[PDB]
Write a protein that binds this ligand. Structure first.
Ligand SMILES: Nc1ncnc2c1ncn2[C@@H]1O[C@H](COP(=O)(O)OP(=O)(O)O)[C@@H](O)[C@H]1O
Length: 352
């Protein structure tokens, strides 16, 4: 690079994201010239946190990984960012336990007068291929190809079809978005500034079973986003389908020699440090008219480990008091333990 490292130091005054709160002159100077084997840089990692000083509805991380090696090469920034975002989980000293045994959720039925729908998602990355911030068009097509091939192996109620977004009409896309089945077009500046809207919709698509109760998003926010959902509040069956579907998807992918990005410190590796560990967001849509307008609601959400979101997701506000309520933490606690903290965390919200 053409200047001293410090000449490139970003202006982060009035930036309220984890990256800006952890970046120091020392860390920046030490990492500016380091690169991953695929050539991903620190400036690319942090660009979204530099360009986006806030967000209208949620606290942001302000950095993304371009590849698996980003988390090693830029550990001096990612590690304190991970600790800050995940309430003390420290990948330098701790390890993460994966647990997808659905039987340990023995009771799971919400009051259907208040809770409209129930959903469990995670993400998975394929090792050897760059993540969405950095992937070339050929890497991204390869991800689609590896995913497509594996998912044709799914049987029974998990049988489904892949739909390329390039071959889907605007009318069919918008329908699926309005019915909470398909991702929005990446217009969010968090995503665009991280390089995650490049070449859209090339190699993006949705795979789903006929009932739309097991869905997989390909190459939007991650390589894959694996989703289980339905109308109502039966979290116990939703999670049994999630665990069964996910274990099979893994086996089908592993059958051809691909591995998921994973290590013992970070659990499953994904684009954004907010989705590390389990990557798991178990949630419901809930009509909480009285509980929402109360001034102490934000304190009850942060203490119960839950996040608030709009009816149309992270970038929207609530409509008709219908709030998206799900677990805030994703690493340090297992998938089982996180589902349990959503079953309990909603019932406090249904009573209160
Ligand atoms: N519990 C839920 N029930 C029904 N739809 C949901 C639920 N949670 C999220 N969604 C839908 O998923 C889509 C993406 O929302 P987002 O907040 O980005 O969730 P995620 O990051 O888990 O994909 C939106 O269309 C949103 O309405």
């Amino acid at each position: 690079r053409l200047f001293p490292p410090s000449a490139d130091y970003p202006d982060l005054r009035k930036h309220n994201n984890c990256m800006a709160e952890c970046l120091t002159p020392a860390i920046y100077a030490k990492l500016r010239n380091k690169v991953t084997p695929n050539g991903y840089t620190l400036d690319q990692c942090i660009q979204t946190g530099v360009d986006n000083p806030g967000h209208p509805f949620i606290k942001t991380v302000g950095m993304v990984a371009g590849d698996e090696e980003s988390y090693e090469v830029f550990a001096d920034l990612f590690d304190p960012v991970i600790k800050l975002r995940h309430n003390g989980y420290d990948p330098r000293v701790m390890k993460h336990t994966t647990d997808l045994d659905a039987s340990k959720i023995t009771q799971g039925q919400f009051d259907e007068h208040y809770v409209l729908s129930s959903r469990v998602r995670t993400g998975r990355s394929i090792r050897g291929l760059s993540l969405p911030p950095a992937c070339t068009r050929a890497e991204r097509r390869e991800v689609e190809n590896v995913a497509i091939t594996a998912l044709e192996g799914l049987k029974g109620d998990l049988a489904g079809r892949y739909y390329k977004l390039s071959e889907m009409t605007e009318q069919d896309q918008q329908r699926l978005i309005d019915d909470h089945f398909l991702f929005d077009k990446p217009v969010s500046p968090l995503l665009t500034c991280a390089g995650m809207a490049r070449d859209w919709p090339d190699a993006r698509g949705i795979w789903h079973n006929y009932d739309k109760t097991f869905l997989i998003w390909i190459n939007e926010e991650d390589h894959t986003r694996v989703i289980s959902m339905e109308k109502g509040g039966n979290m116990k069956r939703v999670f049994e389908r999630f665990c069964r579907g996910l274990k099979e998807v893994e086996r089908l992918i592993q059958e051809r020699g691909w591995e998921f990005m994973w290590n013992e410190r970070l659990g499953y590796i994904l684009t954004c440090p907010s989705n590390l560990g389990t990557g798991l967001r178990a949630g419901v849509h809930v009509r909480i008219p009285k509980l929402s307008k109360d001034p102490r609601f934000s304190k009850i959400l942060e203490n119960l480990r839950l996040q608030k979101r709009g009816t149309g997701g992270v970038d929207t506000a609530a409509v008709a008091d219908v709030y998206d309520i799900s677990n805030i933490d994703r690493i340090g606690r297992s998938e089982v333990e996180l589902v349990q903290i959503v079953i309990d965390g909603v019932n406090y919200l249904v009573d209160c």
